[PDB]
């Protein structure tokens, strides 16, 4: 008993310690704690879709010492790409205090705040991202004027244009942001995420027919973009193609929790919100057999 009691006792003790330190209510069911010390699981995995248990592996390796920038940026990026942007905010806010380095921090953080409604903190995060860059280091109005003061300077600068597009998305000016992403993506036609952010500014522009044309082959780049298929679901809902939208939302719920989630449940991380996309959907079909009754 003594030979292995510590392996679990100290594990639970440090888990609860990390729980009560700052944030991030860890999932109780890891089945990774005894083999998560070779952090390279996330590098061996997630290269071919299946970006669900890779987040679990990164959580299992981040339950250790918290002074690693990679362990606090990979979780944020994966969770943002997994459409669970609830704990990503707090995790990356914890990553904030680990120095203004790791410019991946403050880059997805602008996206992270503009995700739900956080207009105010997104501008501060984007400004902090911009100032933490010595190459060109030399209030919405001031924030956009600072970005406009560079434009041609660093012409390629894909991250700067991505930040500009994200900021433009917050101003409800999707028309100009549409052509921003259109000419931005052609510079690097490799990363599908820049394509994804394109489709959004076409989806919000009441032009879903073009927007889907952006997503489709982008899904071929990495068939793990839950956000892309969420966009397909909402576009099919907008086209009044309700049966196909229902099929797509069911597939989205299946794929998003497509892992050990039934046997590895935590605090549900407000996944009910995603489930809400299903809700009122049958309101178009009036599927009286199921309706709200299966909300559990």
């Amino acid at each position: 008993v003594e030979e292995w009691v510590r392996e679990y006792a100290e594990a639970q003790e440090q888990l609860q310690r990390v729980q009560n330190e700052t944030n991030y209510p860890f999932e109780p069911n890891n089945p990774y704690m005894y083999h998560d010390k070779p952090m390279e699981e996330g590098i061996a995995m997630l290269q071919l879709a299946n970006m669900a248990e890779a987040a679990l592996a990164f959580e299992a390796v981040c339950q250790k010492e918290p002074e690693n920038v990679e362990a606090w940026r990979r979780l944020g990026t994966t969770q943002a790409e997994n459409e669970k942007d609830c704990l990503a905010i707090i995790a990356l806010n914890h990553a904030r205090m680990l120095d203004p380095k790791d410019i991946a921090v403050h880059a997805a953080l602008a996206v992270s705040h503009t995700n739900e409604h956080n207009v105010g903190a997104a501008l501060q995060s984007l400004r902090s991202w911009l100032l933490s860059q010595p190459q060109y280091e030399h209030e919405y109005r001031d924030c956009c004027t600072l970005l406009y003061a560079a434009v041609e300077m660093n012409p390629n600068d894909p991250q700067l244009h991505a930040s500009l597009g994200v900021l433009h998305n917050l101003s409800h000016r999707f028309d100009e942001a549409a052509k921003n992403f259109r000419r931005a993506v052609e510079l690097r036609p490799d990363d599908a995420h820049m394509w994804n952010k394109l489709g959004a500014t076409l989806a919000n522009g009441n032009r879903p027919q073009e927007a889907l044309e952006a997503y489709n082959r982008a899904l071929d780049i990495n068939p793990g973009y839950v956000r892309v298929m969420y966009n397909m679901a909402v576009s099919y809902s907008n086209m009044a193609q309700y049966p196909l939208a229902a099929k797509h939302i069911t597939r989205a719920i299946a794929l998003q929790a497509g892992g050990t989630n039934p046997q590895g449940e935590g605090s549900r991380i407000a996944t009910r919100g995603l489930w809400d996309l299903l809700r009122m959907t049958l309101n178009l079909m009036d599927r009286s057999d199921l309706v709200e009754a299966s909300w559990q």
């Binding site: 459409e83 995700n115 956080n118 809902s237 009044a240 809400d276 009122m280």
Partner: protein, 323 residues
Amino acid sequence: MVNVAVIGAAGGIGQSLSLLLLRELPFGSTLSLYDVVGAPGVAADLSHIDRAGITVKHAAGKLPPVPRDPALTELAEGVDVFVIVAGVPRKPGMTRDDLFNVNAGIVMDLVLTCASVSPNACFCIVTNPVNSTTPIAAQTLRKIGVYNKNKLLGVSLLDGLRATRFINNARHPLVVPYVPVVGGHSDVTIVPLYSQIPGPLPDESTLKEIRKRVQVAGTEVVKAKAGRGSATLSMAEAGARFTMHVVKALMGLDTPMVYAYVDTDGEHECPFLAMPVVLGKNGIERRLPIGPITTVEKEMLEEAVGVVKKNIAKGETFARSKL
């Protein structure tokens, strides 16, 4: 006895609405106010009006908007009637959809906060457009699971008022109190039933003109107001009068009969049309039918419901891009 709450105060349809409500709210009641800016303003400014027996409360908020504001979910407790009257100004461009694309979102927020502390308060929608905002409010209430179709009143009496004022100016010495108006509340979704009113009635050509004007009036204002502003005042009286109708009833001092925008419980298609209704202590208790109409009126109604069928579908599908 009652606690009326105003949410879109002080913008351009605020202070006037609160002032109108203050001078007619029954004795022994409280009036609340709220806005992101100016909350410590007009709220203290109206404390100099005596109106013995009336107490005024207020609550402020951070200038950067925040979903589920902690300060907002303090004053919402204890209220009985809500007036969601918060909107945005009308810039010269303001193309369709995009403007709506803004006006929906805030409204949804203004429903999520004040819904987990009092799911028994009669609601009211004033934000322009109203033909599409009401389905958004209905679905937002349906998300939590506490929804009562009997209290989903939508302000469209500005329409009623308009009609009376015109048909009472042609037929001069004669005067009518109210004129029925079924349909919705925008453009070709408004049918003024001018043939159920007591009197001799003018000719056809004229009736036609008067009719159409009821439909395209807002324009006049917007225009006259040198490409700025909208229609605050008028849109306030309507709101005030209606609110009272509701309040009195609830207490048991009158059983009024109005004409609201309440979901249709199995009535003539178009589940969010405007039909005459009678109020009561529990909201709406009976829905009167449209009644007999002539050939001319049914020509507009047969196509107006088609326009409503498009806005009603665009309404209860709001999910912009998540991301």
